[PDB]
């Protein structure tokens, strides 16, 4: 019984020790995980956690370019937020459709 | 390697026994004849006394109790404490002993060099005394330091004073 | 009061394979100078208690079959001689028992 | 001559060992002597042994380990024997240990093995560069307060003399030998072979050829412990750790018309026999003081 | 249970299918019998497909042996020297064919508890995780309370 | 509550026991050599030479008259009997029997040789492991005596016929832990001995069986043991002292 | 007394299982085991590899001196005649020595090709690792040459596995082309190599002195050694990283727990950057020319 | 019952061949359905492991236990079957290997209690096995020091593997 | 609590105790060598002390002779107490008696025992403990310290 049970629980403690693995790097390359999270989902890079901790501990290079491109998705948000204008756009705030 | 059991009576002959008693008798009594005069050979800088300053103490043997009579007639009764081979071990500073004031090291009547360990022994003989039975630790000021190997008499203290006497309790077991 | 439960042979085993319940070796163990045979430092011999109680027991029963009754304690003093010896200038006066074995070597003149 | 003092050693050892194998090799068939053992505790007793090869600590093994632990000598019937010898023909046994009734050859023989142990300390413990020529173990007796062995150092070694630290440091490398059982086997050799084991010692072939003067068939005792190969008079103790107690106690310095000598005094008690701190300190203290005797 | 069994990480046998694919089933041996109503499907496999499997697989050596056995089996043995024992008692041709099949696409290794979905060798690429892999350097490299 | 123990081992023979039996006891061989040979000082410096120790032999087999009634009984009692291819059987026994002593072969050994011989050969050997060999055989197997045995109490005739051998082996007796005891593999000692043979005659089947083997009580000591021996003396209570033998 | 036979039969086949689990038997030879068909063994072999061989090549390439000296021995025990054909067994002495040869120099060629800057040491210690004992042995053992190499002592030796294996490779080398059989070395003997780095199978023992004497060959003067990061000195487990700077330019870095071990690691970096056998190198390319 | 320690001394070894080390000898011996206790006579048992014959017996003979003087026996027995059967000279040459207690076949009584109440008595034995090999006693084991303890340690460390990770 | 007590507890109580001294007593006395329990042996020793005391006291005198009759329960040692074991001992002060303990009883008790004897005596010696000679290695070294200190002096 315990066996099922962890075989359930083993997917959630997997993912929790992903996403505090990805905390830390985050934090380390001086970003916070939601916000890294939610810009690397806004420019259309589907990664889930096990790659993205795959990469912070194994490919640090890619992973500072991914928290690069996350801060710089974020900058780009607060700044359309701010200016509240339609004709001004983001490069990296574009939008591709299904091809 | 099975080490056997030794004493220092065991490989000893009849005639090499009152010799090795004789021998350490004598050095003791050498020894202890030494150091009575510890005022002329170095000792060390005496201090004017202090407001805040504690002296050294030592260790005496209860030999019994007697009555005594006080002159507006009240009966006391008195314990006999017999400092019979007291002297000064070594000495502890302030800075690695307590921070506050410095160690003395105090040790009481002799006893047989046969039955003390090989550390003992040792600590014993680079002092230059024989061994004691009880060792203890005073609390003093660095200004009451006494050099190690001084003796102490009863004449520390004076008719008319008060003392502090820390001892073992007579055990009653369980 | 009655156990709670049964004590299982893990906890058994720690408290009777401790070292307090385990028996002490002992280093007080030479051998007899004069036999050879195993004897504690401060125990006598055992093979030469056995040779000596045994003489004197032969010693003192050939003592008590030269006296008549029970009650027959000596007043003077004893000696006990072997075969092949006689009583010297200072042992007479006394009384003497004769033994038909020779004079064990442990046994001194005197 | 160019030659390391570690060859030195190793082409010795080859060479005893060359002589061991001789020596060996001399009997090809095994013969069987009938040794009485004449002791006072197990009288009666009768070893079926091997010719030069059993031992009187092969006799000890089959009497009991007692008797291995405690007997130190051997008599074969007409003098002292050291255990690992290998007897030659019939004879009768008695074991001597160091409480006999009589133990003035034990004495003698654990005398000169602490004498011999300090002659190697000493040839091991200097400078490769420097020269150290040990020149014998005189035979002080037992109720001087220390064992001497006789030394020669280098000529710029002339000026200064051993301090506490250095003695401290011998005291260490001598309980470090300790530590280690090394047994001390003998060999019965000649002259002739005498001369070329050791050949670069004066001193020693000197001694070699005084010992050998007195010998109709100028035959000499070799003893050996480890690496090292001395020649001694007399028996041996089988084991080095039945010292217990080791301290190099003194260097004295004896200056003659040929040449000075460093007599090196030490104080040693084994394992049966060891004694109190006091007792050790008071013996040690005898000890450093000078001892002369040679005839 | 993971914790009672054993268990041995991802692996291919001789590093496996990168220059080549080698076919770890080395042969294959039938115990069957002529006339036990159990061995009737191995019966039909021999008389059918038992030739078809040979052609297919060349490189996997088949024995039949028709002896009077109550339980029919099948014995894979693998390049590894690993032997695998199955019973074929009681099974229709289509069981067998799947069976043998699978004996086939096997590698041999222990059916255990694979640690790792995966297994690569120097995954490292353009280097790894260490403490100071992200941490800027100071002029001198002087500690946070070193003077120089 | 009264359950007791069972199984004590003993063994206590009696007289009535002892004759009670019905049928009696069939014996194949007898209890020793009766008549036992006694060799001559003089064989170690007669082998040396052939002519002298064989004609010698001839002579002494020939004139005895107990031993040619002996032989005429033996031939009498069973036909196709010959002392001069003896010999040649005679040492084919011995090197079959020790070729199944070294193999354990326990059967064919029991064929071979008597019951007063296989203990003999067996009991202090069944533990461990022999390597026996026959290398060579310097002077072949001569008779020297025929001794015959009737008796009347059952009707029977026992025959011994005794061979002088003298001839190397390569002996290796080796430790049930696998080490050697005794001896190397490839000496080839020379030994020489008398083996007497026991057929009983009256039996219709009759093997010659090896029964004995006699060694002269001057022939040189055999070869030393590898390992040494302690031998204690007398064991003595305290009520003993030590007598020193002289 | 419990009336079956089916209960009795199964703890029969458990106490053969807990005989042999107590008491292994001897490994015996797959020849030796029942289903056993040597000519169908040997198609099976040339098949399963993809590779065309000649049967009686193989036949003569999987027989060793030492089985034809037993099969000598057996015969002169049993008392027949054999000569007439055992004479011409066609040993694989000569098959194996030019498998050895051809391999060892596909081998070189190969690394020569795939990296200029290692030298010829370098070279001949890879291609030594390569054809080495224990590679062979397990390649062989993986492969099945053991079970049809016809040889005494069934454990079959190191060194007879080896003379098999390169025996089998000469074999196919002279039924196929060399192109042929350098893929299959490539194919069977440098995959034996992943995972593995350079020094691992080169075992150097001064990588500073190397390393200075390929930069003296490159026109370097020296590298000087710099402490680039460190985290604890007064530690029982400190770490130092340990650079080498060429005319204040960095070429390789190196973590160690002491110093001297962090300048030796950066000495062996430098070296496999310069010898090209970095971790991020280009794999090797397994692909049909 | 069970009786393989007799049978445990009867196997034969083939002979070693040249060059082989020399193997030493193991004598095994046993003493069945003795009264002493079970426990009671693994104390003595465990008290004579691992150390020569000679010291075992100097132990056992002034122990004051009543099993001292049947392990004694024992001792002495095996030893003189070492002599005799076995090729074993030096007959101080042989340490205790091996030296068990186990338990044999008891016996059930009555034992009264009072108010007509019983218990079940048991009378115990208890078997002795031993086992002797030819040498010098193995060196006992000292305690782990410092530098071993730090190699562990660091050892373990430097074991490490970044879990759950590629 | 049993500070300064010099006396164990034997038998049923204190009238035991005696009784029990006093068999002992008589034994040894009348046997000139006895062996028993090491405690009881021990606490022996100082009444046959006493009593060779009161022996030596003299015949006449009637406080020892009443001892002498209470604690010799067989009335014919009373004269052998007073005319063969104070004659003997005149010169002594306080050694009239040795007491060395044995090894324990065969039997299952494993009793501690002791043995008590009257120097002096018509039976075998005991094997008595003896030191080492002096010609001991250690001995030797002593006296060598020995000869240079009374050179010395
Ligand atoms: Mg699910
Ligand atoms: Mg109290
Ligand atoms: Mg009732
Ligand atoms: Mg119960
Ligand atoms: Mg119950
Ligand atoms: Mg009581
Ligand atoms: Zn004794």
């Known amino acids: 019984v315990k066996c099922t049970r962890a075989r359930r629980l083993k997917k959630r403690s997997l993912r929790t020790l992903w996403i505090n693995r990805i905390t830390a790097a985050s934090q380390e390359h001086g970003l916070k995980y939601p916000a890294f999270i939610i810009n690397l989902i806004k420019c259309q890079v589907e990664l889930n956690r096990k790659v993205l901790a795959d990469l912070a501990i194994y490919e640090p290079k890619t992973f500072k370019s991914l928290a690069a491109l996350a801060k710089r998705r974020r900058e780009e948000g607060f700044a359309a937020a701010l200016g509240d204008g339609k004709e001004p756009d983001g490069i990296f705030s574009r939008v591709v459709q299904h091809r | 390697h099975g080490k056997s059991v030794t004493w220092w009576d065991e490989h000893l002959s009849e005639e090499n026994v009152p010799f090795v008693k004789q021998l350490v008798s004598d050095e003791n009594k050498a020894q202890l004849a030494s150091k009575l005069c510890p005022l002329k050979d170095e000792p060390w800088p005496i201090h004017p006394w202090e407001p805040g300053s504690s002296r050294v103490g030592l260790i005496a043997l209860k030999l019994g109790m007697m009555p005594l009579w006080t002159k507006d007639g009240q009966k006391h009764v008195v314990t006999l404490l017999q400092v019979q081979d007291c002297h000064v071990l070594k000495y502890t500073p302030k800075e690695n002993h307590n921070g506050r004031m410095a160690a003395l090291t105090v040790g009481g009547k002799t006893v047989s060099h046969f039955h003390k360990s090989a550390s003992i022994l040792e600590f014993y003989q680079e002092l230059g005394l024989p061994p004691k039975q009880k060792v203890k630790i005073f609390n003093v000021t660095e200004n009451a330091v006494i050099k190690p190997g001084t003796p102490l008499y009863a004449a520390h203290f004076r008719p008319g004073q008060y003392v502090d006497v820390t001892a073992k309790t007579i055990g009653k077991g369980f | 009061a009655a156990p709670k439960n049964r004590r299982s042979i893990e906890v058994n085993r720690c408290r009777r394979r401790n070292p307090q319940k385990l028996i002490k070796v002992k280093n007080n163990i030479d051998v007899c100078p004069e036999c050879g045979h195993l004897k504690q430092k401060h125990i006598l011999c055992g093979y030469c208690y056995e040779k000596v109680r045994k003489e004197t027991a032969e010693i003192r029963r050939q003592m008590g079959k030269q006296e008549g009754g029970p009650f027959r304690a000596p007043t003077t003093e004893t000696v006990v001689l072997y075969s092949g010896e006689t009583p010297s200038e200072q042992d007479q006066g006394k009384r003497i028992i004769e033994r038909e074995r020779k004079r064990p070597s442990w046994f001194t003149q005197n | 001559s160019q030659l390391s003092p570690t060859e030195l050693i190793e082409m010795q050892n080859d060479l005893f060992n060359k002589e061991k194998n001789r020596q060996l090799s001399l009997t090809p068939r095994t013969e069987k002597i009938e040794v009485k053992h004449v002791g006072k505790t197990d009288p009666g007793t009768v070893f079926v042994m091997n010719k030069n090869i059993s031992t009187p600590y092969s006799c000890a093994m089959h009497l009991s380990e007692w008797y291995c632990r405690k007997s130190i000598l051997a008599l074969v019937d007409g003098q002292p024997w050291d255990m690992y010898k290998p007897l030659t023909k019939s004879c009768e046994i008695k074991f001597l240990t160091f409480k006999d009734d009589d133990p003035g050859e034990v004495n003698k023989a654990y005398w000169r093995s602490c004498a011999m142990m300090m002659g190697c300390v000493i040839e091991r413990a200097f400078k490769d560069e420097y020269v150290v020529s040990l020149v014998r173990a005189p035979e002080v007796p037992v109720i001087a307060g220390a064992f001497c062995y006789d030394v020669v150092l280098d000529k710029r070694l002339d000026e200064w003399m051993p301090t506490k630290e250095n003695l401290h440091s011998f005291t260490k490398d001598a309980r470090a030998l300790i530590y280690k059982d090394l047994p001390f086997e003998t060999l019965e050799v000649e002259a002739k072979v005498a001369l070329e084991i050791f050949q670069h010692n004066k001193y020693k072939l000197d001694f070699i050829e005084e010992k050998a003067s007195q010998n109709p068939e100028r035959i000499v005792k070799l003893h050996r412990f480890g690496d090292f190969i001395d020649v001694s008079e007399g028996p041996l103790i089988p084991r080095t750790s039945i010292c217990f107690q080791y301290e190099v106690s003194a260097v004295h310095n004896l200056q003659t018309q040929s040449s000075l000598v460093r007599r090196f005094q030490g104080l040693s008690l084994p394992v049966h026999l060891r004694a109190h701190f006091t007792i050790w300190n008071k013996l040690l203290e005898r000890s450093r003081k000078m001892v002369t005797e040679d005839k | 249970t993971a914790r009672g069994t054993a268990s041995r990480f991802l692996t291919s046998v001789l590093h496996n299918g990168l220059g080549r694919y080698v076919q770890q089933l080395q042969r294959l041996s039938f115990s069957l019998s002529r006339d036990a109503p159990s061995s009737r499907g191995a019966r039909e496999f021999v008389e059918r497909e038992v030739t078809d499997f040979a052609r297919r697989n060349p490189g996997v050596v088949i024995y039949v042996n028709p002896r009077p056995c109550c339980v029919p089996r099948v014995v894979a043995e693998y390049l590894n020297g690993a032997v695998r024992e199955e019973s074929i008692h009681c099974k229709s041709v289509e069981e067998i064919a799947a069976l043998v099949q699978k004996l086939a696409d096997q590698s041999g290794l222990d059916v255990i508890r694979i640690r790792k979905p995966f297994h690569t060798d120097s995954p490292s690429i353009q280097g790894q995780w260490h403490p100071f892999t992200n941490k800027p350097t100071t002029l001198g490299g002087l500690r946070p309370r070193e003077v120089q | 509550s009264e359950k007791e123990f069972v199984e004590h081992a003993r063994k206590a023979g009696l007289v009535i026991p002892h004759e009670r039996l019905e049928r009696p006891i069939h014996l194949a061989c007898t209890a020793g050599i009766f008549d036992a040979y006694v060799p001559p000082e003089g064989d170690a410096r007669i082998s040396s030479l052939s002519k002298e120790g064989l004609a010698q032999r001839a002579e002494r087999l020939k004139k005895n008259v107990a031993s040619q009634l002996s032989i005429r009984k033996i031939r009498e009692s069973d036909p196709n009997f010959k002392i001069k291819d003896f010999p040649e059987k005679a040492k084919d026994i011995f090197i079959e029997a020790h070729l199944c002593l070294n193999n354990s072969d326990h059967d064919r050994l029991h064929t071979l040789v008597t019951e007063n011989c296989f203990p003999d050969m067996v009991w202090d050997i069944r533990y461990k492991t022999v390597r026996w060999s026959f290398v060579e055989s310097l002077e072949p197997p001569q008779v020297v005596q025929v001794r015959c045995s009737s008796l009347m109490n059952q009707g029977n005739i026992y025959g011994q016929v005794t061979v002088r051998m003298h001839t190397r082996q390569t002996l290796a007796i080796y430790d049930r832990f696998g080490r050697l005891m005794y001896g190397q593999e490839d000496v080839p000692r020379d030994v020489l001995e008398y083996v007497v043979f026991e057929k009983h005659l009256v039996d219709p089947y009759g093997s010659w069986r090896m029964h004995g083997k006699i060694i002269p009580p001057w022939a040189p000591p055999k070869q030393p043991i590898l390992k040494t021996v302690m031998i204690p003396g007398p064991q003595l209570k305290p009520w003993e002292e030590f007598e020193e033998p002289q | ?289 | 019952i069970s009786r393989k320690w007799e049978k445990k001394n009867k196997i034969v070894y083939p002979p070693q061949l040249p060059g082989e080390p020399r193997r030493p000898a193991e004598i095994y011996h046993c003493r069945r359905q003795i009264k002493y206790s079970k426990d009671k006579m693994w104390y003595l048992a465990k008290l004579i492991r691992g150390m020569s014959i000679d010291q075992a017996l100097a132990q056992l003979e002034f122990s004051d236990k009543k099993g001292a003087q049947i392990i004694k026996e024992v001792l002495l027995e095996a030893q003189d079957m070492a002599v005799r059967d076995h090729n074993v000279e030096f007959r101080s040459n042989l340490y205790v290997a091996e030296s068990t207690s186990g338990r044999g076949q008891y016996l059930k009584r009555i034992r009264y209690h009072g108010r007509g109440r019983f218990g079940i008595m048991e009378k115990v034995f208890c078997h002795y096995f031993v086992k002797l090999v030819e040498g010098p006693p193995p060196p006992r084991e000292a305690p782990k020091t410092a530098v071993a303890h730090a190699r562990e340690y660091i050892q373990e460390l430097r074991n490490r593997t970044i879990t759950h990770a590629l | 609590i049993s500070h300064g007590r010099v006396f164990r507890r034997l038998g049923l109580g204190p009238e035991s105790r005696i009784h029990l001294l006093q068999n002992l007593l008589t034994g040894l006395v009348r046997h000139e060598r006895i062996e028993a329990s090491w405690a009881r042996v021990d606490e022996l020793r100082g009444y046959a002390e006493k009593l060779i005391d009161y022996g030596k006291l003299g015949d006449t005198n009637e406080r020892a002779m009443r001892m002498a009759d209470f604690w010799l329960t067989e009335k014919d040692l009373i004269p052998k107490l007073f005319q063969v074991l104070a004659p003997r001992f005149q010169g002594q002060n306080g050694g009239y008696t040795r007491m060395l303990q044995i090894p324990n009883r065969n039997e299952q008790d494993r009793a501690k025992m002791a043995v008590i004897e009257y120097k002096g005596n018509c039976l075998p010696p005991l094997p008595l403990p003896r030191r080492d000679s002096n010609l001991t290695l250690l001995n030797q070294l002593l006296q060598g310290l020995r000869q240079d200190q009374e050179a010395s002096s």
């Open chain 7, 1 to 289: 007394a419990k009336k079956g036979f089916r209960a009795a039969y199964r703890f029969q086949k458990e106490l053969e299982r807990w005989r042999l689990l107590r008491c292994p038997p001897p490994p015996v030879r797959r020849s030796e085991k029942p289903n056993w068909d040597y000519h169908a063994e040997i198609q099976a072999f040339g098949h399963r590899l993809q590779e065309t061989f000649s049967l009686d090549l193989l036949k003569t390439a999987f027989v060793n001196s030492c089985y034809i000296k037993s099969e000598e021995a057996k015969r002169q025990k049993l008392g027949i005649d054999k000569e007439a054909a055992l004479l011409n067994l066609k040993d694989n002495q000569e098959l194996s020595e030019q498998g050895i040869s051809f391999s060892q120099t596909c081998l070189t060629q190969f690394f020569e090709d795939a990296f200029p800057d290692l030298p010829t040491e370098g070279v001949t210690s890879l291609v030594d690792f390569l054809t080495s004992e224990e590679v062979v042995c397990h390649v062989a053992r993986n492969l099945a040459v053991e079970q049809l190499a016809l040889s005494a002592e069934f454990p079959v030796p190191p060194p007879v596995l080896r003379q098999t294996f390169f025996a089998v490779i000469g074999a196919l080398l002279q039924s196929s082309g060399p192109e042929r059989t350098a893929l299959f070395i490539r194919d069977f003997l440098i995959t034996q190599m992943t995972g593995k780095e350079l020094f691992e199978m080169w075992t150097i023992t001064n990588p500073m002195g190397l390393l200075v004497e390929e930069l003296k060959k490159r026109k370097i003067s020296a590298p000087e050694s710099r402490l680039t990061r460190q985290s604890g000195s007064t530690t029982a487990l400190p770490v130092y990283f340990v650079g080498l700077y060429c005319d204040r330019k960095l070429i390789a870095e190196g973590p160690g727990e002491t110093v001297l071990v962090a300048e030796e690691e950066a000495a062996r970096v430098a070296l496999r950057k310069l010898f090209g056998f970095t971790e991020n190198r280009r794999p090797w390319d397994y692909s049909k020319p």
